[PDB]
Amino acid sequence: GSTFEEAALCTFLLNKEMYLKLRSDVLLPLTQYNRYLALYNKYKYFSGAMDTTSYREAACCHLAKALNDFSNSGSDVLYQPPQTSITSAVLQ
Amino acid sequence: GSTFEEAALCTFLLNKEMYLKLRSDVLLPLTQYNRYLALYNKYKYFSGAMDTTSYREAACCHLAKALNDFSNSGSDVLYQPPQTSITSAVLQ
Amino acid sequence: GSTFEEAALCTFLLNKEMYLKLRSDVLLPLTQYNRYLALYNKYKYFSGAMDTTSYREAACCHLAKALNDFSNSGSDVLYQPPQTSITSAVLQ
Amino acid sequence: GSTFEEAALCTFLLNKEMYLKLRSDVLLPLTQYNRYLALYNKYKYFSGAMDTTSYREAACCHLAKALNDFSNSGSDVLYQPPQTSITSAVLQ
Amino acid sequence: GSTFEEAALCTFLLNKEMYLKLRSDVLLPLTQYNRYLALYNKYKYFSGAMDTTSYREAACCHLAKALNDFSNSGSDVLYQPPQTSITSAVLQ
Amino acid sequence: GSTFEEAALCTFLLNKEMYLKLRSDVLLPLTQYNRYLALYNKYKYFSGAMDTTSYREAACCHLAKALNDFSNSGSDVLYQPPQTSITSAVLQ
Ligand code: NA
Ligand code: NA
Ligand code: NA
Ligand code: NA
Ligand code: NA
Ligand code: NA
Ligand code: NA
Ligand code: NA
């Protein structure tokens, strides 16, 4: 929801406390979290074959991917939203 | 539209070329641009009396305000999105 | 003192060690720390009704507020100084 | 050379003066500049099918691409190095 | 004054308009601007031989130096405050 | 190696896990890590008397210094690469 979407655009320390709040915020709707993990791969390595390059949607996937890596690590990491681009915004 | 909303979240050089592309993107719908200028003052000086503090909505107002200041200046300025806050995202 | 004032302008990981060093640096003078907490709310939600908007003073309040939130949390957070603004520096 | 490689890692205002200094620095060796433009597309959209993801090499391509866009625009833009990633540095 | 001191801590586009406002703000007191240029050299290359390493004072010198380079160039540049350091703040 | 060199250019949370991966990456070659610690002092305080100011080499020293401070502290810190400078890249 809002919490996750707005958090995906921030730079923050991803730790147990933060992982809990953001991961919970995307438990519902159900398929929500898995869709963002499916799109991370496209948005990161196969951006060329994408007829939708929403920056917010990209950020949500970058955060989802980060929560996932943390769920298999427990090691705190600095989360950073994906690089913005004014030339990318003017081109759709 | 998307261009403006996505641009409001970037850090870029606001010059004539950029002012034209972003200002045009918010000519329609009509009241769009004026609403963002009305909300800028609330989001900046009267945040306390607001039962809606969407970060994206805040960014759109910060950019609208920037385009306005540029329309009465012609002097290029570095645009920067408003400060993010993970504690603000977890608090509604 | 200097340590706190200079720290309020940095981006750092606020943890127990750092909380101890900065909170100690503002134990004296006595009313120092409480004044910065009183001003945080003005600088954040009631900026309009303020005939003094010193950026350094704003940063000191943002840090004081951060130390306070940490004293009731123990959870490490990334501290970030408040958004700067060249248009704010030229306007008094 | 050094100037371009080191500049590709900085955040600066790309204008005529800067375009001249950096573009000149990559006139020699000859194929240098064209190779960086060929690699930009891979790094940006086809990163998945790439058995070499040097961050410095990525930055050089991002800057080359920026000089190119400027050569067909004359409009000053803020240049920003590509997003860094500690998780990308530990994975080769 | 305040304008210059507060500006020295911001990231902004240094152009004719901005150069005029900030350079004027340090015309008085008289020796003000020249002292900051004398200290830039120490703060940048001879930091070791300094019994005073105030970050704000360092920023003021970095900005003074920037205004000077601009006075002999007319070419707009992105100004950036000097790197902050929490380990530098805790050590005086 | 690549891991350390590329990491020295990133902004990340330096913790036990990260300290282990980066410190290991510079165990070999042998004198590697000690040379970067010797150069840190020059780059930070005696930059003036230095006929080699490679930014990457500077970053490697800033990271080496950070790993060292962490080896005698165990307290997680946010690592930040040294301030970049386009005016420094055009001057060798
Ligand atoms: Na939800
Ligand atoms: Na529109
Ligand atoms: Na004190
Ligand atoms: Na060359
Ligand atoms: Na890599
Ligand atoms: Na003055
Ligand atoms: Na090695
Ligand atoms: Na250099």
Side-chain angles (χ1 to χ4, degrees):
Chain A
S2 304
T3 303
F4 180 97
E5 300 172 24
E6 178 170 339
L9 304 173
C10 301
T11 296
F12 60 88
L13 191 172
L14 177 58
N15 57 11
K16 293 176 301 183
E17 302 71 359
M18 201 57 56
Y19 166 81
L20 177 57
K21 297 180 177 181
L22 306 176
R23 182 71 189 84
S24 310
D25 194 44
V26 284
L27 284 167
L28 291 173
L30 300 179
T31 58
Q32 183 67 327
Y33 182 79
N34 294 1
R35 307 191 209 98
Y36 295 145
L37 292 178
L39 280 56
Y40 173 78
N41 313 290
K42 293 179 179 179
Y43 267 117
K44 179 62 173 171
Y45 317 102
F46 306 92
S47 302
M50 299 192 70
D51 53 356
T52 178
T53 57
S54 173
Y55 171 76
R56 301 193 307 269
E57 188 176 19
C60 289
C61 300
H62 277 73
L63 181 53
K65 183 62 173 61
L67 298 183
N68 181 337
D69 291 354
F70 182 88
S71 68
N72 311 332
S73 168
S75 60
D76 303 6
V77 295
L78 176 66
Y79 169 85
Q80 287 174 310
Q83 182 61 20
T84 67
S85 181
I86 191 58
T87 187
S88 179
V90 301
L91 292 178
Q92 301 140 318
Chain B
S2 303
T3 302
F4 179 97
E5 299 171 23
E6 177 171 338
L9 304 172
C10 301
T11 296
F12 60 88
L13 191 173
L14 177 58
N15 57 11
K16 292 174 300 183
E17 302 71 0
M18 201 57 57
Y19 166 81
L20 177 56
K21 297 180 179 181
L22 304 176
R23 182 71 189 84
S24 311
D25 194 44
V26 284
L27 285 167
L28 290 172
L30 300 178
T31 59
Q32 184 67 327
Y33 182 79
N34 294 359
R35 293 192 297 261
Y36 295 145
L37 292 178
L39 280 57
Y40 172 76
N41 306 290
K42 293 179 179 179
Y43 268 116
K44 179 62 173 171
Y45 318 103
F46 306 92
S47 302
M50 301 191 70
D51 51 348
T52 300
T53 57
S54 173
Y55 172 76
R56 307 202 311 270
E57 188 175 18
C60 288
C61 300
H62 277 73
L63 181 52
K65 183 62 173 60
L67 298 183
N68 182 337
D69 291 353
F70 182 85
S71 69
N72 311 332
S73 167
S75 61
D76 303 6
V77 296
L78 175 67
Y79 169 85
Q80 287 175 310
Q83 182 61 20
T84 67
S85 181
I86 192 58
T87 187
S88 179
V90 302
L91 284 183
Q92 279 216 55
Chain C
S2 303
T3 302
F4 179 97
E5 299 171 23
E6 177 171 338
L9 304 172
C10 301
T11 296
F12 60 88
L13 191 173
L14 177 58
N15 57 11
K16 292 174 300 183
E17 302 71 0
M18 201 57 57
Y19 166 81
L20 177 56
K21 297 180 179 181
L22 304 176
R23 182 71 189 84
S24 311
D25 194 44
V26 284
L27 285 167
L28 290 172
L30 300 178
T31 59
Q32 184 67 327
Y33 182 79
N34 294 359
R35 293 192 297 261
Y36 295 145
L37 292 178
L39 280 57
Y40 172 76
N41 306 290
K42 293 179 179 179
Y43 268 116
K44 179 62 173 171
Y45 318 103
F46 306 92
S47 302
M50 301 191 70
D51 51 348
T52 300
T53 57
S54 173
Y55 172 76
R56 307 202 311 270
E57 188 175 18
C60 288
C61 300
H62 277 73
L63 181 52
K65 183 62 173 60
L67 298 183
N68 182 337
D69 291 353
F70 182 85
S71 69
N72 311 332
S73 167
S75 61
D76 303 6
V77 296
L78 175 67
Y79 169 85
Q80 287 175 310
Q83 182 61 20
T84 67
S85 181
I86 192 58
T87 187
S88 179
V90 302
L91 284 183
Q92 279 216 55
Chain D
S2 304
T3 303
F4 179 97
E5 299 172 25
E6 178 170 338
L9 303 173
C10 301
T11 296
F12 59 88
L13 191 171
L14 177 59
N15 57 10
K16 294 174 301 183
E17 302 70 359
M18 201 57 57
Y19 166 81
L20 177 57
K21 297 180 177 181
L22 305 176
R23 181 72 189 84
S24 310
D25 194 43
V26 284
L27 284 167
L28 290 173
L30 300 178
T31 59
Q32 183 67 327
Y33 182 79
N34 293 359
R35 291 182 296 94
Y36 295 145
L37 292 178
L39 280 56
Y40 173 77
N41 314 288
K42 292 189 292 185
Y43 271 122
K44 179 62 173 171
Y45 319 104
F46 307 91
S47 303
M50 206 159 185
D51 53 356
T52 298
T53 57
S54 173
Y55 171 76
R56 307 202 311 269
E57 188 176 19
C60 289
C61 300
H62 277 73
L63 181 52
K65 183 62 173 61
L67 298 184
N68 182 336
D69 291 354
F70 183 88
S71 69
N72 311 332
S73 169
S75 60
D76 303 6
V77 295
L78 175 67
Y79 169 85
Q80 286 174 310
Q83 182 61 20
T84 67
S85 181
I86 192 58
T87 187
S88 178
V90 302
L91 289 178
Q92 302 113 63
Chain E
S2 304
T3 303
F4 180 97
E5 300 172 24
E6 178 170 339
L9 304 173
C10 301
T11 296
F12 60 88
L13 191 172
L14 177 58
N15 57 11
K16 293 176 301 183
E17 302 71 359
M18 201 57 56
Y19 166 81
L20 177 57
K21 297 180 177 181
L22 306 176
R23 182 71 189 84
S24 310
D25 194 44
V26 284
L27 284 167
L28 291 173
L30 300 179
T31 58
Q32 183 67 327
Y33 182 79
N34 294 1
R35 307 191 209 98
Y36 295 145
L37 292 178
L39 280 56
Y40 173 78
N41 313 290
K42 293 179 179 179
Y43 267 117
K44 179 62 173 171
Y45 317 102
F46 306 92
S47 302
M50 299 192 70
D51 53 356
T52 178
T53 57
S54 173
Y55 171 76
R56 301 193 307 269
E57 188 176 19
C60 289
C61 300
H62 277 73
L63 181 53
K65 183 62 173 61
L67 298 183
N68 181 337
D69 291 354
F70 182 88
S71 68
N72 311 332
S73 168
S75 60
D76 303 6
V77 295
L78 176 66
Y79 169 85
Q80 287 174 310
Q83 182 61 20
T84 67
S85 181
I86 191 58
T87 187
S88 179
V90 301
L91 292 178
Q92 301 140 318
Chain F
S2 304
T3 303
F4 179 97
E5 299 172 25
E6 178 170 338
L9 303 173
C10 301
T11 296
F12 59 88
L13 191 171
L14 177 59
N15 57 10
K16 294 174 301 183
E17 302 70 359
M18 201 57 57
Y19 166 81
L20 177 57
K21 297 180 177 181
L22 305 176
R23 181 72 189 84
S24 310
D25 194 43
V26 284
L27 284 167
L28 290 173
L30 300 178
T31 59
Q32 183 67 327
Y33 182 79
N34 293 359
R35 291 182 296 94
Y36 295 145
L37 292 178
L39 280 56
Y40 173 77
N41 314 288
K42 292 189 292 185
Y43 271 122
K44 179 62 173 171
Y45 319 104
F46 307 91
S47 303
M50 206 159 185
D51 53 356
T52 298
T53 57
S54 173
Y55 171 76
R56 307 202 311 269
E57 188 176 19
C60 289
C61 300
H62 277 73
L63 181 52
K65 183 62 173 61
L67 298 184
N68 182 336
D69 291 354
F70 183 88
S71 69
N72 311 332
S73 169
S75 60
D76 303 6
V77 295
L78 175 67
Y79 169 85
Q80 286 174 310
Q83 182 61 20
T84 67
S85 181
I86 192 58
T87 187
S88 178
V90 302
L91 289 178
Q92 302 113 63

